[PDB]
């Protein structure tokens, strides 16, 4: 019938077993795994999914626990990736306790180390893997933003690759670029899609806001360099951009706002946000209220005045600017000095001076 | 019929979007390198198929066949070589 067969004839003992496993018929699967001797646990349905991949897909923890105890069970590697993809934390814990993962270093080794050995571990059928070959469990957990699954894998020691520079001349980057140059470019985005997710930024590094700010710049530059995947890097840049805003939005007192803005008062992170054009970070009300208090340093009463009053003081500064400058030289540090050093006043002084300059230009041609 | 035409249009794009290595992209674009399916997509105006990043990166490598260093140059440098060629 169908042109393509993805699985023959699926003898009744196996077809009844697959039906039991898929729909969580726990008493039957326990009966068949124990008593039956003419059935293999690796029979597959029409989609090439064995019993384990069916039970994990439908979230059958009790069926999965029964299957994991059965020896020579296949597709255990993919079953973890399927459970991670759907965020089945209890199933992920059940699979990670299998000897296949506890004894081996699969979670700790890099995707390149996993790829150098074929080992057909994460393969889910006769040929191929469910997700991209370079997507390790930690990268897949980061992509789906499973915070608990990311934390579980981080405890196991899994870390994302942190790939090399785009213009890298090392042997590994030279070989990958010459080999495929499309799998390599897709592999770079998959690693960056995991590095830029909030579930990995907050749970991995010591300073998630600083790491996100740097990664936001790094992904924005990659968008210009690799124009074909411009949208892919541009979206990943935004994920880092709104993580920093998300963290800033949670501050509830001035001490917390100080740590986010000043970093470890030189507003280091505000300068970085302006440098990296993280506009929602600078324009957030938590950030603006901090700049506003610095803006009106010693002008306590002038903060709440109307625009008309603030236009009056601009005129007053403009008229008295020669006297204010003379007073500043005579008394650099005084009541006049502190007011004149206020950031708002220095802006008014520069605005007033320019208005006087426009006055001289017009007054010059008054005849 | 216009809606049914779009369902076929975005199935081909959907299949193209799933390619993960150059060998798979070659089969989708070249058919069974004469880009037979790219010509058909242009002939049948399947614009999302041709404009997909997987398809564009394949055309781009053919576009800069022997100009390895010229691929990543700025527009100003590429305007300089146009003047030099002229």
């Amino acid at each position: 019938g169908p042109a393509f067969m993805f699985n023959t004839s699926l003898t009744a003992e196996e077809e009844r077993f697959l039906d039991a496993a898929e729909y969580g018929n726990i008493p039957v699967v326990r009966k068949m795994l124990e008593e039956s001797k003419t059935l293999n646990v690796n029979c597959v349905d029409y989609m090439g999914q064995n019993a384990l991949q069916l039970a994990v897909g439908n979230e059958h923890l009790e069926v999965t626990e029964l299957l994991l105890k059965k020896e020579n069970l296949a597709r255990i590697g993919d079953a973890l990736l399927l459970a991670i993809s759907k965020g089945y934390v209890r199933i992920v814990e059940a699979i990670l306790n299998h000897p296949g993962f506890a004894a081996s270093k699969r979670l700790t080794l890099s995707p390149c180390e996993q790829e150098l050995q074929d080992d057909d571990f994460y393969a889910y059928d006769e040929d191929g893997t469910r997700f991209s070959p370079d997507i390790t469990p930690i990268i897949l957990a980061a992509h789906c933003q499973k915070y608990e699954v990311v934390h579980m894998l981080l405890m196991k020691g899994a870390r994302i690759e942190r790939p090399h520079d785009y213009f890298c001349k090392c042997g590994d980057c030279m070989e990958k670029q010459r080999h495929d140059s499309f799998s390599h470019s897709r592999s770079r985005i998959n690693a960056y899609k995991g590095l830029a997710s909030p579930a990995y930024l907050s749970l991995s590094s010591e300073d998630p806001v600083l790491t996100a700010l740097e990664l936001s710049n790094e992904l924005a530059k990659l968008a210009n360099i690799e124009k074909e995947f411009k949208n892919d890097y541009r979206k990943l840049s935004m994920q880092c951009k709104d993580f920093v805003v998300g963290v800033l939005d949670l501050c509830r007192d001035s001490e917390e706002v100080e740590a986010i803005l000043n970093g470890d008062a030189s507003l280091s992170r505000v300068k970085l946000a302006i440098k990296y054009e993280v506009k929602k970070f600078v324009a957030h009300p938590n950030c603006q209220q901090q700049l506003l208090t610095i803006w009106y340093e010693n002008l306590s009463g002038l903060r709440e005045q109307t625009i008309a009053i603030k236009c009056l003081v601009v005129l007053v500064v403009a008229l008295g600017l020669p006297f204010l400058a003379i007073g500043y030289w005579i008394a650099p540090c005084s009541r006049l000095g502190k007011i004149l050093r206020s950031p708002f006043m220095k802006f008014v002084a520069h605005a007033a001076s320019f208005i006087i300059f426009l006055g001289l230009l017009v007054f010059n041609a008054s005849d | 019929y216009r809606k049914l035409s779009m369902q076929c249009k975005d199935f081909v794009v959907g299949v193209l979007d799933l390619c993960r290595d150059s060998e798979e992209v070659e089969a989708i674009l070249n058919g069974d390198a004469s880009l037979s399916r790219v010509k058909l997509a242009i002939k049948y105006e399947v614009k999302k198929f041709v404009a997909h990043p997987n398809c564009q990166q394949q055309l781009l490598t053919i576009w800069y066949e022997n100009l390895s260093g010229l691929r990543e140059q700025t527009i100003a440098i590429k305007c300089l070589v146009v003047l030099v060629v002229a």
Binding site: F4, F6, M47, G48, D127, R130 | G14, L18, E24, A27
Partner: peptide, 29 residues
């Protein structure tokens, strides 16, 4: 019996159905 093109098409079509059924599971209930 199958050629490389047929094997590749089998891989991509099977990959499509699994992706399509997952995207069906993302629809609103």
């Amino acid at each position: 019996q199958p050629t490389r093109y047929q094997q590749i098409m089998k891989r991509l079509i099977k990959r499509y159905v699994l992706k399509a059924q997952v995207d069906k599971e993302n629809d609103e209930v």
